[PDB]
Symmetry: D2
Subunit: 117 residues, 4 copies
Amino acid sequence: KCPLMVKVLDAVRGSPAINVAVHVFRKAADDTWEPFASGKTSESGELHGLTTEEEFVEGIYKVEIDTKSYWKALGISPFHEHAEVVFTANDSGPRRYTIAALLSPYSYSTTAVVTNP
Amino acid sequence: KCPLMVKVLDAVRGSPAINVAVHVFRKAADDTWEPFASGKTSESGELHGLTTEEEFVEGIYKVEIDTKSYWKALGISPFHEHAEVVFTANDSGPRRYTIAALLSPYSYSTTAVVTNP
Amino acid sequence: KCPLMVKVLDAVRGSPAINVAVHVFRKAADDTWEPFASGKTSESGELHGLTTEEEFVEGIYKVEIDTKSYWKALGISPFHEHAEVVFTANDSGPRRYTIAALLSPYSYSTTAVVTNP
Amino acid sequence: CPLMVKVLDAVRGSPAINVAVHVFRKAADDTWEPFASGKTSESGELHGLTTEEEFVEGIYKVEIDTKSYWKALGISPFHEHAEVVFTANDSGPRRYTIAALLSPYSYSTTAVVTNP
């Protein structure tokens, strides 16, 4: 439904992650990660308000999820400082990309779903 | 080592799991599951010496990994009863199958990597 | 929402799985897997309507996903014959369990999300 | 090698081959200093890319080049690379094992930490 939907689940409490910071960047022509969007992970573990179709142009994007502090909040010292997903968007036309994240104290995984209208 | 290798990793502790029971079944001609091998997971989180080339035949197999006993010992109530992998094996000739399982209190993942002799 | 939702994603094409048979069983008192529900994975990759709060009694369950046929249709030789998830349920309250499966030709992962309505 | 990168393929069910690995360092000026590089062997594992003389406390980063891999095999992938950012040797040396399960449109990561 959305051109970019990133959401986070927890593998310890079996619940979507709560209060996890998200930062989105884009690769500029000079290879600089200019900020592109930001937000906070909702109680449902999903992030929205990132972008619309009009400003989502072809190029290289990067999604960053702040996992390091989230585990300190719950009293566990984690491994990763954050999680980063880098992908090409709208290479051959408008698509719909879904990004998933299954965190853990010392692990995570990422998947992608492309609607290809 | 063994024709069938099972590697079990813990996510929250970032270690291979220890004291994890493993049971192996082989499907008979009567469509019933019978014991074929069993054992406990070592400190390295791997299973070795389960079967042999003579014992390995072309049929349907099943690998069972006990997780609830593993998590209860550590003071966390898990979700899954156990982890089980069912697959066809050796139908196309002698190959090698190694099965990896990454555990969590509320999740697990299975992957099979096949190498020719 | 339904007390037990199971959904399947395909990694290879980055889309939800299509035409993947789902069978749900419940552990009877005689350690027999009597059928409980069944269905087919929708074009959106999600399966719902398996059970209600009253039917979903406390006990041990098993969710079976037919993956061997799924790859054979699309021209890929599978590894796994099927995927199965076994867990305890309704320890105290319905809890609206959620089961998620991510498919690859030679790998698959499952996660569980537990709430308290 | 304190750091090990172990990569598999979920489509062919084999360790990934001919994929490049790069390691960086977090400088005090927030720059990424290259630290080591290589190409994955037939076993999908890497070793000899770090040493206790070079492996020091701070913030590291591991990048696994996967975009070219699927093009070589005739598949259009999704990601460009996998990045694993973490701290290292906060208190005492230890062995870090960083796995990665690759597939088109999907990948995973798990870190295994050993006391010595």
